[PDB]
Design a protein around this ligand. Sequence first.
Ligand SMILES: [Mg+2]
Ligand SMILES: [Mg+2]
Ligand SMILES: [Mg+2]
Ligand SMILES: [Mg+2]
Ligand SMILES: [Mg+2]
Ligand SMILES: [Mg+2]
Ligand SMILES: [Mg+2]
Ligand SMILES: [Mg+2]
Ligand SMILES: [Mg+2]
Ligand SMILES: [Mg+2]
Ligand SMILES: [Mg+2]
Ligand SMILES: [Mg+2]
Ligand SMILES: [Mg+2]
Ligand SMILES: [Mg+2]
Ligand SMILES: [Mg+2]
Ligand SMILES: [Mg+2]
Ligand SMILES: [Mg+2]
Ligand SMILES: [Mg+2]
Ligand SMILES: [Mg+2]
Ligand SMILES: [Mg+2]
Ligand SMILES: [Mg+2]
Ligand SMILES: [Mg+2]
Ligand SMILES: [Mg+2]
Ligand SMILES: [Mg+2]
Ligand SMILES: [Mg+2]
Ligand SMILES: [Mg+2]
Ligand SMILES: [Mg+2]
Ligand SMILES: [Mg+2]
Ligand SMILES: [Mg+2]
Ligand SMILES: [Mg+2]
Ligand SMILES: [Mg+2]
Ligand SMILES: [Mg+2]
Ligand SMILES: [Mg+2]
Ligand SMILES: [Mg+2]
Ligand SMILES: [Mg+2]
Ligand SMILES: [Mg+2]
Length: 86
Amino acid sequence: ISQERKNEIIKEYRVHETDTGSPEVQIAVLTAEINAVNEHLRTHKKDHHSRRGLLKMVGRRRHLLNYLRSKDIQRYRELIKSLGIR
RNA sequence: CUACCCUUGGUCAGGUUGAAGUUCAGGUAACACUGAAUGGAGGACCGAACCGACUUACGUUGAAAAGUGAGCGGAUGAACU
RNA sequence: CGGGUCCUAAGCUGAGGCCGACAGGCGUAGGCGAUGGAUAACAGGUUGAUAUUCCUGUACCACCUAUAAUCGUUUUAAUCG
RNA sequence: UAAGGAACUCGGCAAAAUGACCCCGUAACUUCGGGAGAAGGGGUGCUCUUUAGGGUUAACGCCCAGAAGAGCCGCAGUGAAUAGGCCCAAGCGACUGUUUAUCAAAAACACAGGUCUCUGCUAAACCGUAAGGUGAUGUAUAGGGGCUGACGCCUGCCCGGU
RNA sequence: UCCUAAGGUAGCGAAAUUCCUUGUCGGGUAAGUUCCGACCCGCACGAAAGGCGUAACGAUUUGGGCACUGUCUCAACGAGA
RNA sequence: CUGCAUUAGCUAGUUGGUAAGGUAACGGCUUACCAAGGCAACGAUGCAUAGCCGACCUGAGAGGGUGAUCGGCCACACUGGA
RNA sequence: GGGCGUAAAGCGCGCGUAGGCGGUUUUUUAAGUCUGAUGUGAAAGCCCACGGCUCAACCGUGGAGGGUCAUUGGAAACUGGAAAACUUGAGUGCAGAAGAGGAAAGUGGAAUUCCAUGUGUAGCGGUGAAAUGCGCAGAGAUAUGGAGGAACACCAGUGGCGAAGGCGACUUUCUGGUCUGUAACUGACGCUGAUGUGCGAAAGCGUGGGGAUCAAACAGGAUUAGAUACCCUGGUAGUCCACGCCGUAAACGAUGAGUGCUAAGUGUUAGGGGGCCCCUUAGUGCUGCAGCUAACGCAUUAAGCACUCCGCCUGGGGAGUA
RNA sequence: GUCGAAGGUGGGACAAAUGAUUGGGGUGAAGUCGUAACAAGGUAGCCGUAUCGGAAGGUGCGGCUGGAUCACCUCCUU
RNA sequence: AAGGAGGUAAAAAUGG
Ligand SMILES: [Mg+2]
Ligand SMILES: [Mg+2]
Ligand SMILES: [Mg+2]
Ligand SMILES: [Mg+2]
Ligand SMILES: [Mg+2]
Ligand SMILES: [Mg+2]
Ligand SMILES: [Mg+2]
Ligand SMILES: [Mg+2]
Ligand SMILES: [Mg+2]
Ligand SMILES: [Mg+2]
Ligand SMILES: [Mg+2]
Ligand SMILES: [Mg+2]
Ligand SMILES: [Mg+2]
Ligand SMILES: [Mg+2]
Ligand SMILES: [Mg+2]
Ligand SMILES: [Mg+2]
Ligand SMILES: [Mg+2]
Ligand SMILES: [Mg+2]
Ligand SMILES: [Mg+2]
Ligand SMILES: [Mg+2]
Ligand SMILES: [Mg+2]
Ligand SMILES: [Mg+2]
Ligand SMILES: [Mg+2]
Ligand SMILES: [Mg+2]
Ligand SMILES: [Mg+2]
Ligand SMILES: [Mg+2]
Ligand SMILES: [Mg+2]
Ligand SMILES: [Mg+2]
Ligand SMILES: [Mg+2]
Ligand SMILES: [Mg+2]
Ligand SMILES: [Mg+2]
Ligand SMILES: [Mg+2]
Ligand SMILES: [Mg+2]
Ligand SMILES: [Mg+2]
Ligand SMILES: [Mg+2]
Ligand SMILES: [Mg+2]
């Protein structure tokens, strides 16, 4: 995604101002990246190399989600319902 | 009459099976995928009408110059008329 | 009511036309041609023998004649087409 | 139709047997559709009691349709009639179709698929003396002819002869 | 080594093809010129006049079972023309 | 307290509840009803093998092998049921 | 109380589930962990002692032993559980770097083959030497034009990129990863990874295209004792494209991943900081201590020293067979 | 009358033995044919794959060095 | 000057 869209997403999902490393911010940006790569792959089906990075992003988001669900169930539920990633 | 064809019409009780597609649920990063429901395909299934003619008995100066009785095959199809 | 005084399909025929020893064959316009399209009447009664045909009752279609509420009266504007 | 039960016969030809509905259950193999109604079993009448339902109706009523239990009768309850016999193997043809009207229905024809070959359009092929037509109101993913004949795995060598 | 254009590959094989022949061996039967499996001295298979397989299908040809029975042992009685 | 996954699914009185019956006794032990539960990769199920132990043999030990005689516990008495 | 570079042994490589394991501090719990008491672990046996058979075996009597045992009381360092903090690991933000990383379209030059035509004559081609073959119907050579397929000369480098396989003309679009500095940001969120799920050179399979070159099969010639070859002349599949399938290679560094620690010298790729020099990060090479090794050799890109997890081995055949 | 051993009937599952015939494997004596590998083994070998051939093997494509080697350039180490 | 890595020519009868 563009740095502008990334800035918009981090502004939207940041827990507080100046927050860029929160699980919410990271997983929202990862959701955007995953969707963009999925849209790319839909046209360029045979781009296995890109799809591999996509899967790395998916696993990173999964681990962030596991950590967030372990730390704060309510935050996890709110975030997943906000992002539509369940 | 009969073969093929042309144009235009008609007919095929009843029962059965349950293709594709779709929806819902689950599932996936997304797809595959799984289940249920829905759906109603087929020179598909059983079986009358209808078409046919495998076996057999009878008939053989016949009821009939090719039939009759009992079984037999197809029966939405390259169907029958 | 079914057919004709309506329509066309396959097919048949075919002015001129094209072709061919003769005979004649082919074919355009045009015709003919239902198995299809269009198309106004029903119930009851009655005879030995016909009946949506005769009779009774009640309809409908096309056309004609007279009288007409109303509208028109020559670029028309009523009306036909 | 006693006893027997294919000993008949070219051959189980004919006959006999099976046959309906419900429930249980069902193999190899398979192109995953099937094979399958595989096979192999169980139930089936009538009376009464209790009782979940569905359609139509204000309701009553009418119609459809189960479950459980307890009883009754016969040799026998789809009490008649109508209604698959089944299985294990092998050859052939893939299959549904078609055929010698009137001794042959098949392993024959056809077939979807394969391949070869001709054909550039007034196409090739075909009918006709021709005109005129079919091909086609089509145009090489098309049209004619030959051979092969679903599908799977394959299809070797020889161009001297014709 | 002779000859040829070149000498039959895979698969299959006493076969819808095998004369000899009821080949031989194994299975099935009390007994099997048929049948099934195998062998290969293929008289005289063989790759689109296709080779070899093949689920499903068949009034197809073939061998074996269960059931069944007047087909038979071996005939008898009854009804009707 | 045992081997195998070239055994991955098993279970329908099965798992729980209610009532009754039954037993010295509790209990699905059995029956009737309701529910769909129960077990399993921490190895269920299936298959194979086996009486278990105190002990015995061996080994420096850790371990490995064995389960005669003697003692304990179990199971059986031609086979199966009562 | 062993191993896996070359002896048998690292899955071809990712992504990732269960499980195993897990950074620093504080408080708390007592499951593991440690310690005391009680009961029990029959008898016989083994071991130690004593006594009786004349000895011994043997017999007898005491002692000792044997539990991963149970109940109960105590400790809190470590592992486990609960609560609270940290930024060093791991990600994120911010500023920068290079790249044959991948996918899809388009453009281009050289060269090969073929077709047409002009000139031209008797060879061409090929080999160790030859012949098959092509060519007097005009070959080969030469000039021009056309058809079409395939690969990208120089750059090019122990160079770059990618998990591996792999990626080299140029242009555009889409897209993955990596590295450097910074210290806002989260606050252990990590490592490994059975089962699973994907990618995976070449050959090969299916359908449809395409077809220059090269070339299994195959034909001819040569060599040879023979020559089902090596060599020569042809030549089909295939080699190319799309979409599916296959899932294997000496898929190799014959070297699993992560992490830290342990002398040095010298290149090179992409960066950064301080004065051509010094320092520094990440790679990529060479040389070489300690240490390791059967040896060869490895040696901050370990095959050294250690911890975690996975895979794998246990003489050669039989056999990667049934 | 319920339960009920044995028995009967049926289609399946599993195990063992056996079977005309058939397939490779191992061992064995101076057997027959060739000579693939080890040196550059006289065509470097080997790996995966495809196909062909009496046989070892040959050939094609990609891969490896666990390959010898005369001349050349390109770098790195002492 | 001596060693390590990459590319790359030319040659070739047959049997010991
Ligand atoms: Mg039918
Ligand atoms: Mg007929
Ligand atoms: Mg009849
Ligand atoms: Mg039928
Ligand atoms: Mg029928
Ligand atoms: Mg005239
Ligand atoms: Mg009419
Ligand atoms: Mg009359
Ligand atoms: Mg009798
Ligand atoms: Mg009798
Ligand atoms: Mg007989
Ligand atoms: Mg007889
Ligand atoms: Mg009969
Ligand atoms: Mg047929
Ligand atoms: Mg006839
Ligand atoms: Mg007949
Ligand atoms: Mg034929
Ligand atoms: Mg042929
Ligand atoms: Mg015979
Ligand atoms: Mg023949
Ligand atoms: Mg032929
Ligand atoms: Mg045929
Ligand atoms: Mg038929
Ligand atoms: Mg025993
Ligand atoms: Mg020892
Ligand atoms: Mg090794
Ligand atoms: Mg490896
Ligand atoms: Mg004791
Ligand atoms: Mg390939
Ligand atoms: Mg060649
Ligand atoms: Mg391997
Ligand atoms: Mg390896
Ligand atoms: Mg370095
Ligand atoms: Mg040799
Ligand atoms: Mg060699
Ligand atoms: Mg060859």
